[PDB]
Amino acid sequence: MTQAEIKLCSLLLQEHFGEIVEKIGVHLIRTGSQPLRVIAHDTGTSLDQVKKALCVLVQHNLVSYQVHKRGVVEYEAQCSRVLRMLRYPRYIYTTKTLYSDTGELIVEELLLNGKLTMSAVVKKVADRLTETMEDGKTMDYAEVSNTFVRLADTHFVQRCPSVDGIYWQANLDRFHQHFRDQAIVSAVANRMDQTSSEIVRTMLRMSEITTSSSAPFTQPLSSNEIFRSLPVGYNISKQVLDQYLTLLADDPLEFVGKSGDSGGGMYVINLHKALASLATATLESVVQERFGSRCARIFRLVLQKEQKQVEDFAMIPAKEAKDMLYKMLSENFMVNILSAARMLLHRCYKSIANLIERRQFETKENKRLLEKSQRVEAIIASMQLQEIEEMITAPERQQLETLKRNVNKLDASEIQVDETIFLLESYIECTMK
């Protein structure tokens, strides 16, 4: 489908929703759009267990339903939407960044609890922000409400589609468009300068409503329309802008291109070139992370430019060079951009699956101890307290903290591997022209 993708979907549906939901979800992912009775029959599950499983998956925006030909309700699940569960910590973080704890909680609630009306969200968030507050002061629902409206305006939050519209959901495409723009801007910043990245940031912002999250180029923009829409904080004159725009167009990176000229010169953002570059950068990262600085140096050289001309420009030992070329061809790096991006994506799905399995293994192996911890924590809630904590012995506390540290490392790795998955998927889907 791939099987890496199914295994990963299965693991996520199990960890969050358990046995039956995982069976039904993986069934729909594998077999496609079908009515309730076919699901029950094909999975050897009772209509009652199927009904509850579909309810949990619809609630959590993982299953959609549509009325077909003879008025029969069919259900569908898509593999990618299940895979985006790995991206939830990032979506929540990205929101915090743009709309503070108020925005962070709005998106956290929508993703974690699924479909909810605006009222449900405002009531949950305002109540959550009030508990974190020191005696009194209170959280004004009006401000939580304004944050919600700003999110909906900037499309980070949208009403679920009907066949209803009373429920809200996070718009993953919107986060995806933002992550793409952010990656490009950061790349322009660390290679060129602050003004260059700011111009590119302005250009991508004025492209938010005009270009799709997977297009290879932005809509052409004049220097005048870019100048008009520049941030107020920037005191850059139109002469300084045209100077930077031609400096951006005439760059080895090739992120900005003159499409017209025209008044006062038409400029596009080479989104595909920008992604190809980010992809090659992560590939280099993986080469150094696995085979070292030597192998990574010779890989970088293969990206620029036959061993007759290769070894003559390598500037490293001949016997050493031969060893490197084997490791990179066999492990599929040596360089074809897409092919190597596609295989690393595949390896990423295998990595995250191993990460989850290891965590599930660690928590299962310490189930009795974790239960002892939870029980001790719960007793502390009722209103000396030192003796109830002494239940968990010094060796036990060492094991729990070790487990917390291990899980936290595995969780952090999961987010890290998914940051790579985003870059690969983005490059791969952009390369569909």
Swiss-Prot record:
* Family named by the database record: Belongs to the eukaryotic RPC3/POLR3C RNA polymerase subunit family.
Task performed by this protein: DNA-dependent RNA polymerase catalyzes the transcription of DNA into RNA using the four ribonucleoside triphosphates as substrates. Specific peripheric component of RNA polymerase III (Pol III) which synthesizes small non-coding RNAs including 5S rRNA, snRNAs, tRNAs and miRNAs from at least 500 distinct genomic loci. Part of POLR3C/RPC3-POLR3F/RPC6-POLR3G/RPC7 heterotrimer, coordinates the dynamics of Pol III stalk and clamp modules during the transition from apo to elongation state. Pol III plays a key role in sensing and limiting infection by intracellular bacteria and DNA viruses.
**GO CC annotations, alphabetized:** cytosol; nucleoplasm; RNA polymerase III complex
A single GO molecular-function term is: single-stranded DNA binding
- Subunit structure as annotated in this protein's UniProt entry: Component of the RNA polymerase III complex consisting of 17 subunits: a ten-subunit horseshoe-shaped catalytic core composed of POLR3A/RPC1, POLR3B/RPC2, POLR1C/RPAC1, POLR1D/RPAC2, POLR3K/RPC10, POLR2E/RPABC1, POLR2F/RPABC2, POLR2H/RPABC3, POLR2K/RPABC4 and POLR2L/RPABC5; a mobile stalk composed of two subunits POLR3H/RPC8 and CRCP/RPC9, protruding from the core and functioning primarily in transcription initiation; and additional subunits homologous to general transcription factors of the RNA polymerase II machinery, POLR3C/RPC3-POLR3F/RPC6-POLR3G/RPC7 heterotrimer required for transcription initiation and POLR3D/RPC4-POLR3E/RPC5 heterodimer involved in both transcription initiation and termination.
Further facts: Antibodies against POLR3C have been found in the sera of patients with systemic sclerosis (SSc).
Q: What is this protein called?
A: DNA-directed RNA polymerase III subunit RPC3
Annotated InterPro entries? POLR3C_WHD (IPR055207), RNA_pol_III_RPC82-rel_HTH (IPR013197), RNA_pol_III_Rpc82_C (IPR008806), RPC3 (IPR039748), WH-like_DNA-bd_sf (IPR036388)
Native organism: Homo sapiens (Human)
A Pfam family found in this protein is POLR3C_WHD
Domain of life according to the entry: Eukaryota
Tell me which Gene Ontology terms the entry assigns under biological process: defense response to virus; DNA-templated transcription; innate immune response; positive regulation of innate immune response; positive regulation of interferon-beta production; regulation of transcription by RNA polymerase III
Q: Which UniProt keywords apply?
A: Antiviral defense, DNA-binding, DNA-directed RNA polymerase, Immunity, Innate immunity, Nucleus, Phosphoprotein, Transcription
Localization in the cell: Nucleus
The question of whether Nucleus is a record keyword is answered with yes
